C-alpha cells in the first residue's frame, strides 16, 4: 500500500523545499535561479536554472555529476531516475534571485551602496521591467542601523496581482561587523506569454481600440454582386 493523497501532495512539497534550499546554499555563486522538478515514474528530472549555465557543468560536464550522485544518495530513490538539466535563464534582469545575488557580489566586492544599488536598478529597468525596488538594510555607516530604499518605476503592494506580477528575494550578506539583508522586488511586464511576465493584464487597465473611419454614404447604393 502507499501513502494517502493528503500526505502525498505535501511530501512532494518538502522535497522541493529542501532541494531548493540546498541548491541555493551550494550554487549561490554561479547565479542559481530556481529548480523545475518534472516528475515521471521513469525518471524524475530536475531542471536547474542558472545565469552562466556552461560554468555550472564544470569541465565538459563534471561539476553537476557530483550533484546527481548527491541527490541520488540523499533522497532514497535509486539511480537512473533523475536527470539534471542546467538551463540558461530567460532574462537575469527579470529574476529577483539573480539580482539579489549580484548585489551581494558588488557589496562584498567593496563598492559603494549608492552605485551598486543604482547599477542593479539601471540594469533591471533596462531589462524591460515596469518597475523595481531595492532595499538594503543594516549597519551601512556607523553602528546605528539604517535602511536605504531605491524605488524606480511602478510597484504593486496590494491585492492578488502582487502574487504574479512581482517577485521578491531576500538575501543576507555577511560583512565584517554584522549582517546586511537586502530585499529586491521587480514588477514584471506584460506580453501574454512570451515566457516573460504574466499573460493576465492588470485588473484595472482598460484598453480601448481605435475606431476605423467607415466610408460615409451619400446615395442609397444598391450594388449587386
Amino acid at each position: 500500500v502507499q501513502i494517502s493523497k493528503k500526505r502525498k501532495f505535501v511530501a512532494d512539497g518538502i522535497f522541493k523545499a529542501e532541494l531548493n534550499e540546498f541548491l541555493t546554499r551550494e550554487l549561490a555563486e554561479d547565479g542559481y535561479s530556481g529548480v523545475e522538478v518534472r516528475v515521471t515514474p521513469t525518471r524524475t528530472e530536475i531542471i536547474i536554472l542558472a545565469t552562466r549555465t556552461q560554468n555550472v557543468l564544470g569541465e565538459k560536464g563534471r561539476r553537476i555529476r557530483e550533484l546527481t550522485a548527491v541527490v541520488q544518495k540523499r533522497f532514497g530513490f535509486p539511480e537512473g531516475s533523475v536527470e539534471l538539466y542546467a538551463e540558461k535563464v530567460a532574462t537575469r534582469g527579470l529574476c529577483a534571485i539573480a539580482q539579489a545575488e549580484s548585489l551581494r557580489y558588488k557589496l562584498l566586492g567593496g563598492l559603494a551602496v549608492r552605485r551598486a544599488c543604482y547599477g542593479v536598478l539601471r540594469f533591471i529597468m533596462e531589462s524591460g521591467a515596469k518597475g523595481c525596488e531595492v532595499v538594503v538594510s543594516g549597519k551601512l555607516r556607523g553602528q546605528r542601523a539604517k535602511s536605504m530604499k531605491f524605488v524606480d518605476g511602478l510597484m504593486i503592494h496590494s491585492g492578488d496581482p502582487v502574487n504574479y506580477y512581482v517577485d521578491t528575494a531576500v538575501r543576507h550578506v555577511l560583512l565584517r561587523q554584522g549582517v546586511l539583508g537586502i530585499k529586491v522586488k521587480i514588477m514584471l511586464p506584460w506580453d501574454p506569454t512570451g515566457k516573460i511576465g504574466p499573460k493576465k493584464p492588470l485588473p484595472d487597465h482598460v484598453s480601448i481600440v481605435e475606431p476605423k473611419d467607415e466610408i460615409l454614404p451619400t446615395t442609397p447604393i444598391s450594388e449587386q454582386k
Binding site: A112, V113, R114, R115, R141
Partner: peptide
C-alpha cells in the same frame, strides 16, 4: 564615494571635508 559621503555627513563635524571632496570630484582637477 564622495556623493554618499556628502549626503551622509553634510550635517556632521566632517561636513566641510566631504564638501571639498565632492567639489574636487565634480570640478575636475
Amino acid at each position: 564615494d564622495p556623493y554618499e559621503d556628502f549626503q551622509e555627513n553634510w550635517n556632521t563635524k566632517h561636513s566641510s571635508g566631504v564638501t571639498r571632496e565632492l567639489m574636487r570630484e565634480l570640478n575636475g582637477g
